[PDB]
């Protein structure tokens with residue numbers, strides 16, 4: 001037995017571009033992911049988000065699956081260009097109606113909505129004016145956030161500004177692997193900083209508009225381990241934690257500057273007077289969302305892009321080639337309490353990709369996933385027993401979906417989607433998770 005606190009929030013998570021399809025229905029503007037995925041070469045098999053899970057039509061059914069599984073919270077994102085097709089200015093009522101229906105249904109069924117404002121589908125119109133590179137996005141994003149708060153904050157009270165701003169900045173603008181597909185280190189660090197400014201401004205507006213809600217922000221994290229006791233391996237680890245994990249953003253939010261080893265690597269790429277923005281950046285947040293999947297062995301490496309490389313290891317791995325390290329989710333929960341002590345934490349994503357098949361017997365026997373989930377939930381339970389204020393846990397994902405530059409080739413769902421028919425088939429992991437939520441814990 002591992003019982004969780006009373007009221008602990010068991011969740012599933014999605015994102016708009018990954019599941020909705022119909023990216024241009026009902027007056028929506030193009031997003032950067034529409035243009036990026038329609039560009040030849042950017043995404044595995046030429047996949048796009050044109051159809052996806054077709055949630056834009058099947059939304060009532062999907063929520064009926066959430067209700068049927070007795071899952072208590074649904075984390076979903078809003079497509080900015082469905083709401084304001086040019087990014088600023090004109091509000092598309094039909095985009096607001098689509099999300100109103102999802103919000104009302106969830107509340108009817110007593111399911112708690114957690115809204116992600118930004119999960120990567122920037123309006124193409126704003127990308128043409130620089131996107132996250134342009135300091136003006138702090139105003140654009142505040143105006144968008146304000147529209148959401150005005151229209152939905154009477155019913156939604158749990159809000160997330162940005163999903164994984166490191167990935168948005170660095171994978172989008174330095175590695176060029178995600179939209180908008182750029183490779184410029186100076187842009188990428190201007191984007192980090194603008195993401196902070198935008199986040200803080202949204203928080204400021206939220207205090208003015210939704211005087212009874214809670215607002216937070218979500219970070220990707222890895223559990224990095226050093227290759228040795230060596231000279232500099234423990235430092236590589238230090239650097240990777242500070243750059244890749246929550247501190248790149250929480251050092252500014254909580255302490256008013258970027259982390260030490262980040263400024264060592266990147267002071268030259270950040271704007272000249274970036275500190276002028278840091279007191280506004282410290283706008284108080286109500287919680288921190290941490291996402292966690294894998295862990296990594298890392299070494300000092302004098303030839304690498306940024307003095308760090310990954311030493312591969314012989315550990316179980318998901319279809320992503322990601323190492324299964326369940327104790328990272330404990331480590332990161334302990335570390336956030338230790339370093340910044342936020343009042344409330346949520347695990348906003350945890351999950352895995354495996355090559356799921358439908359069996360002759362009609363079922364998906366994803367024991368590899370049940371094992372992955374059960375193990376990580378156990379490590380989260382542990383951190384609760386050592387005082388980490390963890391108030392909820394969100395499985396990535398309710399559905400198999402468009403997995404960014406991987407396309408439909410990676411399945412992270414607790415419900416299997418057959419794309420040829422759009423039929424949902426609850427996987428074992430999903431029936432299982434249902435019982436975890438019924439029992440409010442393990443065994």
Ligand SMILES: [Cl-]
Nearest residue numbers: 133134135136
């Ligand atoms: Cl600018």
